[PDB]
Amino acid sequence: MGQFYSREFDGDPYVDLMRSLPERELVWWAQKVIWLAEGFTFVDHFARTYPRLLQHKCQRCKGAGVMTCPACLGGGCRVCGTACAWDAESEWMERWGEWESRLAYYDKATGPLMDEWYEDVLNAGNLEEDTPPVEDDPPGPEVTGRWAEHDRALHKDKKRMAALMRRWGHPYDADANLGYQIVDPTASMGENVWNMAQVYNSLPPELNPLRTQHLADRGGGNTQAAVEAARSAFDAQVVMEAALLQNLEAAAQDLPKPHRLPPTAGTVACNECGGAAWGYSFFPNTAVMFGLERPFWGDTLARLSKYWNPTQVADPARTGQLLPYGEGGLRRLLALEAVVGKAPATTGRYRRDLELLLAHPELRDGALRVPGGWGPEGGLQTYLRGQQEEQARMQRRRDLA
Amino acid sequence: SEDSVEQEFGGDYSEASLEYIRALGPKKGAPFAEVDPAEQAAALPPSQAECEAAKAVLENY
Amino acid sequence: NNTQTNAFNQNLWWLLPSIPTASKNQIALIRLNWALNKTNINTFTDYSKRNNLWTTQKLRNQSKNNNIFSKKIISKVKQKKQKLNYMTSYLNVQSEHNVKIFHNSWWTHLNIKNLVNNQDSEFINSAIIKSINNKTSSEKETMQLLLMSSSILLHLCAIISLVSISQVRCFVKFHLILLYKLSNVYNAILNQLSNKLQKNLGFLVEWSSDFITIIPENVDIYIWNVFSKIYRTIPLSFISTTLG
Amino acid sequence: PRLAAVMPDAVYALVQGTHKLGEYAHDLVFPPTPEDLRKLEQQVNATIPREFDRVRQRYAEGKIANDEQLSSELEDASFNWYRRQLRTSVVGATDEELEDVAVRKLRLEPPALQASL
Amino acid sequence: LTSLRGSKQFLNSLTILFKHQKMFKKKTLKAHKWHSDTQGIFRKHEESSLSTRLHIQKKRKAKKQRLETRRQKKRTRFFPRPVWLRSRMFLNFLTERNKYYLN
Amino acid sequence: ELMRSAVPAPGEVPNRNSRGQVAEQVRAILDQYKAKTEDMVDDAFTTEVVEEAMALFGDANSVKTAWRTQEVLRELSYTQLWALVGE
Amino acid sequence: AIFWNKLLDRVQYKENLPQAGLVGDMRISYAKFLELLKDQRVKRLVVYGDMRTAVVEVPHPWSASVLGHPATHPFYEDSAHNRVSMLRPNPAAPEDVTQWFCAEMPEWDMEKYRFYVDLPGDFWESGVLQRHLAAQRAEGAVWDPASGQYILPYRAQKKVFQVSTEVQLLDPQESWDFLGWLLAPGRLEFYEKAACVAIALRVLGIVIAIST
Amino acid sequence: VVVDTGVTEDDRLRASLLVQMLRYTVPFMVISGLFWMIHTWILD
Numbered sequence A: 001m002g003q004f005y006s007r008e009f010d011g012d013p014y015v016d017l018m019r020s021l022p023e024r025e026l027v028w029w030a031q032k033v034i035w036l037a038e039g040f041t042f043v044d045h046f047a048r049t050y051p052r053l054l055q056h057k058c059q060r061c062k063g064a065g066v067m068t069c070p071a072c073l074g075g076g077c078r079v080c081g082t083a084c085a086w087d088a089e090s091e092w093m094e095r096w097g098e099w100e101s102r103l104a105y106y107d108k109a110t111g112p113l114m115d116e117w118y119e120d121v122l123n124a125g126n127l128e129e130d131t132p133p134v135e136d137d138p139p140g141p142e143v144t145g146r147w148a149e150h151d152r153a154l155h156k157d158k159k160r161m162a163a164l165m166r167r168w169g170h171p172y173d174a175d176a177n178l179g180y181q182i183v184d185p186t187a188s189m190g191e192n193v194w195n196m197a198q199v200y201n202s203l204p205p206e207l208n209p210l211r212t213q214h215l216a217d218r219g220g221g222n223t224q225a226a227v228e229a230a231r232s233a234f235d236a237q238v239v240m241e242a243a244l245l246q247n248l249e250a251a252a253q254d255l256p257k258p259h260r261l262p263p264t265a266g267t268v269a270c271n272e273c274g275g276a277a278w279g280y281s282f283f284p285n286t287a288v289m290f291g292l293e294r295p296f297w298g299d300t301l302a303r304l305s306k307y308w309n310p311t312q313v314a315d316p317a318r319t320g321q322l323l324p325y326g327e328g329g330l331r332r333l334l335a336l337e338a339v340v341g342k343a344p345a346t347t348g349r350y351r352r353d354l355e356l357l358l359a360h361p362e363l364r365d366g367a368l369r370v371p372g373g374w375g376p377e378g379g380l381q382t383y384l385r386g387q388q389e390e391q392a393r394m395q396r397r398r399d400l401a
Numbered sequence B: 001s002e003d004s005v006e007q008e009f010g011g012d013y014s015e016a017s018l019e020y021i022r023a024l025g026p027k028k029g030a031p032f033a034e035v036d037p038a039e040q041a042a043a044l045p046p047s048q049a050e051c052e053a054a055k056a057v058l059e060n061y
Numbered sequence C: 001n002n003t004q005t006n007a008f009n010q011n012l013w014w015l016l017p018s019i020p021t022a023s024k025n026q027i028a029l030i031r032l033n034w035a036l037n038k039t040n041i042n043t044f045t046d047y048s049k050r051n052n053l054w055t056t057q058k059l060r061n062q063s064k065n066n067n068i069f070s071k072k073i074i075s076k077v078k079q080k081k082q083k084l085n086y087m088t089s090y091l092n093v094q095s096e097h098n099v100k101i102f103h104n105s106w107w108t109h110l111n112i113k114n115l116v117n118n119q120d121s122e123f124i125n126s127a128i129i130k131s132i133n134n135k136t137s138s139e140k141e142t143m144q145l146l147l148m149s150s151s152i153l154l155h156l157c158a159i160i161s162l163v164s165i166s167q168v169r170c171f172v173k174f175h176l177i178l179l180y181k182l183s184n185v186y187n188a189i190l191n192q193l194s195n196k197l198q199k200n201l202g203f204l205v206e207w208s209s210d211f212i213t214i215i216p217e218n219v220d221i222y223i224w225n226v227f228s229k230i231y232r233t234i235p236l237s238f239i240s241t242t243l244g
Numbered sequence D: 001p002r003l004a005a006v007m008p009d010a011v012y013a014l015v016q017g018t019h020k021l022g023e024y025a026h027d028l029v030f031p032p033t034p035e036d037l038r039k040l041e042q043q044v045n046a047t048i049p050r051e052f053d054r055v056r057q058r059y060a061e062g063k064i065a066n067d068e069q070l071s072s073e074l075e076d077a078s079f080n081w082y083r084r085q086l087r088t089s090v091v092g093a094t095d096e097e098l099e100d101v102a103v104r105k106l107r108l109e110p111p112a113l114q115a116s117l
Numbered sequence E: 001l002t003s004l005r006g007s008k009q010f011l012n013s014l015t016i017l018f019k020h021q022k023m024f025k026k027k028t029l030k031a032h033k034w035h036s037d038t039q040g041i042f043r044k045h046e047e048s049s050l051s052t053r054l055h056i057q058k059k060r061k062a063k064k065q066r067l068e069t070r071r072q073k074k075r076t077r078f079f080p081r082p083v084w085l086r087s088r089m090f091l092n093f094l095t096e097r098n099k100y101y102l103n
Numbered sequence F: 001e002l003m004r005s006a007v008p009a010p011g012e013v014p015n016r017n018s019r020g021q022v023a024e025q026v027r028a029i030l031d032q033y034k035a036k037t038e039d040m041v042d043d044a045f046t047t048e049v050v051e052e053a054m055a056l057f058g059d060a061n062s063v064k065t066a067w068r069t070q071e072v073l074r075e076l077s078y079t080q081l082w083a084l085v086g087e
Numbered sequence G: 001a002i003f004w005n006k007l008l009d010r011v012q013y014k015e016n017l018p019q020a021g022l023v024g025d026m027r028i029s030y031a032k033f034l035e036l037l038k039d040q041r042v043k044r045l046v047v048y049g050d051m052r053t054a055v056v057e058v059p060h061p062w063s064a065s066v067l068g069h070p071a072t073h074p075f076y077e078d079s080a081h082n083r084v085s086m087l088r089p090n091p092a093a094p095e096d097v098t099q100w101f102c103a104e105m106p107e108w109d110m111e112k113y114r115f116y117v118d119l120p121g122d123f124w125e126s127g128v129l130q131r132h133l134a135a136q137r138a139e140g141a142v143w144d145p146a147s148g149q150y151i152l153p154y155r156a157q158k159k160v161f162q163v164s165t166e167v168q169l170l171d172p173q174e175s176w177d178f179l180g181w182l183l184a185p186g187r188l189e190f191y192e193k194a195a196c197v198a199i200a201l202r203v204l205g206i207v208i209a210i211s212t
Numbered sequence H: 001v002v003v004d005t006g007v008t009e010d011d012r013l014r015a016s017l018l019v020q021m022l023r024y025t026v027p028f029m030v031i032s033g034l035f036w037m038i039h040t041w042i043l044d
């Protein structure tokens, strides 16, 4: 690259030979960059892999940071943790509904079809068509049956879609889905984060503040508050997901987890460590250095088999012990569950819906697909109430005329 | 009586397409970058009835 | 896109347009990454096999627009089976998997240790020392001195062996000259401005030469003097410690 | 040049080359039978779909092609078989209703053991 | 009144669409053994339009086989795309996005 | 039915695509591009439109929470080995 | 493929942590996990390399059985296109539908939550998993001589919403973290660029040398 | 079932000590060989 001329480069027997051969200078520059790349890689590997010898673990909890509360194995326990959010089993399908709604925004799987349809509905002037298909026409009315209903509803295909287009626009215009050509799977990561960081493109419409930045005052004092108070919970959920996945990636190997989380509803914190499961020590932790940190299956088998088999050396004849250990043995000493098992008591909350699914077999039709849920506010019962109410509305409208 | 969708479309379709449109969402709200009706219904201040009741209570006061 | 792998990359992240504000910036960047992953575009690689199964006829007709029998029919039916399996419920085949080269991982680009512990190791040493005391007069002192000595020697041997690779020395040299130029800048600024307020009150010639001829001996003598002075009280300290 | 494509090609070359070298060195120490080379031909013959038989005999009697008229001939039979497979997968085979597809993909019926003995 | 509930109009099943618009080659029928008998329990114990559309499809494919089609080829993306497909796609997108109001 | 395994097979496990594979599928389908009647076999629908019908409402693409089913479902786990040994 | 598919699962082991059914803060408590386990609601349990972390997979309540509930995808249909059902009336306890018997859906057709759970330090010596396994595997077909038949007893069949747990453990040696770090995509593109430039310079050396 | 086991050495620390040294030293050899390939076996 013609840099080794000047007078600052005399005195080296090799720079002069590169003064007369620019190919040599090109080779020199290439090598002088590659060697530095290699040095960076060496040092990065060392700094990544060396701290693994200095990690030691608590020997009571074995690096879990958490022990069990045994009473909760067989108005609750006041000693052991607090329940989590996805423990309320009655709110599962609602949370999943919200999440799949928010996810349908970003989802760019069907991108090409939406793109071709958007381009067709924008231009609407090219018309590079070809020979239309030989059309069979729907049955005339007055033929009652199932096949007739299928064909009749199928043929009314263009006016219904037209009404759909008239009510809701193309999804890219209502901002319902992500933009037109914001992301490209083969461009680069940097360009895609640039395009997505541009105008709140990472946020769905419901949480985009621009949608609301114009009206909020004395009336409720809430709309611009109850939106920044939802976007916050959203971002907390996302960061929690990142933390959980880093823990799983550490546990995929046998490494100790980086994020220590507080105990939960069945566990208490270890009292040797405070719950900090492991640490760094400047002492090299020989068990890792020689590869002896896993315990040889037969040993564990022996230890457990001897733990689950307590031995009685005394005999209840000499020592007048008539009952096994425990309290209140006397009261302990005083239907067809044996034929058809026990009844499961975690699924009563669905009983009602099940009964409906037996009184109305027509609900099992392959054409219908309700939202999903259990309460009178979800799925099946919503459709059923709607059907009965609209048939009653139409019944009352028949007689008035 | 006389819901909203029954006006913009009405006799242009039967009852089949009307129930078709009725079971897909209220009109066009928060998911579609618009403003909800229950969202807009909060931006308005107390109207003259409450203000006059307050003024009469102020006379009493 | 050039500093993708090094930690220096994180510095660029802060160049885009209850708790402090730095936490909010970090959370915004993590949300950006999560959102860019949630769009289901990271698995697409155009050199895939699932891709070359459907764009074979296109290339064939691009080129033609420009026992063997059983072999050919078997190859055709095999490609058709692969298509079917990628498409729907076909019940005896095994698909091939592809390298994923895109926003891979996503959960590693970010240091979130400071957020999860709400910032906005004594059991270890105790247990080590107590164990070597309990298991095996003045024998505990021999064992403890052996422990400390071997640990320090392990760390020193690791460092020296690392620095004995040539490319690592190139890395060190490059860093040294960069840091020297930055020190020159900062020192010049402070010197000039302090001169003002007390009145009130290129790189290639280095990067391409030997390094012991550019650096004077004065600095080696200074380093040696400081080191010597630091560690010269070790014999008396050691003696007075070990003698009760 | 896009090593993310070279690595699968490298492992594929290794696998296929090892297999070919193995079969070479295996039919030398053990020369192949001069007649059951027809038997393995029959074994692979019993596995071809039916959509190809209309072509197959045509190749014996000259009629078929020069070299490319054939290569475009196999594509038609291939796509016919392909669309037949799509139909069989989704809506069922040639002689079974929807219930038989349901009992096929629910694995309600065991493989017949009493008959085979 | 307008609450997301779905209805039998949106035929959300590929067997229906394929048996009404794409696949008409009929089957050699015989008595089965599994059937949805009484109590709705699965237990073990209009051919005019069909044939019409079938012959239509055979004629169209014979036509486009002889390259008699518009531009010149046997396999291309016939610009005029079926509208039922697009209607169903928009339907499903709309349902999953309008689930937002179900709280 | 008495001599059936309950450990299915490695072969009868059908593929199921996640969302990323669905996206890859639609992309690979879109960038995809005498004899006469009474000689065609009765499967003469237009090919590359049923393919798209099945890459949207099809069984292999209808489970939204499918991660990698064929691989992690063709290997056998501890309970399945216990059931196999017992037969 | 048979070989390569395996090899690739070890180098790229990070792309296989479950990113499908796990969305946000998906933790459950240890007591809730135990309560789900004891009632046979968990379909798959995946203990991890260090034996102190599990990913519990629980099917969506309507995808657990083969009820014909119209909130699921129509996988299995009658001739008249109605979803099939498999309920059986449980003679011992009628008047309560949640105690009836029903077959369970094949695992590949299920929707599943994928919760994350941290197991305590004494998870193995407490014997919870062992008790569950030993109970659920201790039932099967029997011979009744009073009727001279092969009977699958009722207390060995699945009621509504119950499934059969599959326990699976992972091997820490199947991770191959070093190569996963060495052949990362960024490093791959760097190697590609450097190889291209090196080939270019070598061929240019050849060109300027032979034309001399 | 024909249940079969291994050899199982009794030391545990003399058995694994030459293989652990290799586990620590080989990565540097791999890195150096890869970069050598690039910058010398091509850029001769």
Ligand SMILES: [Zn+2]
Residues within 6 Å of the ligand: A058, A059, A060, A061, A062, A063, A065, A066, A270, A271, A272, A273, A275, A277
């Ligand atoms: Zn502890």
Ligand SMILES: [Zn+2]
Residues within 6 Å of the ligand: A069, A070, A071, A072, A077, A078, A079, A080, A266, A267
């Ligand atoms: Zn407790």
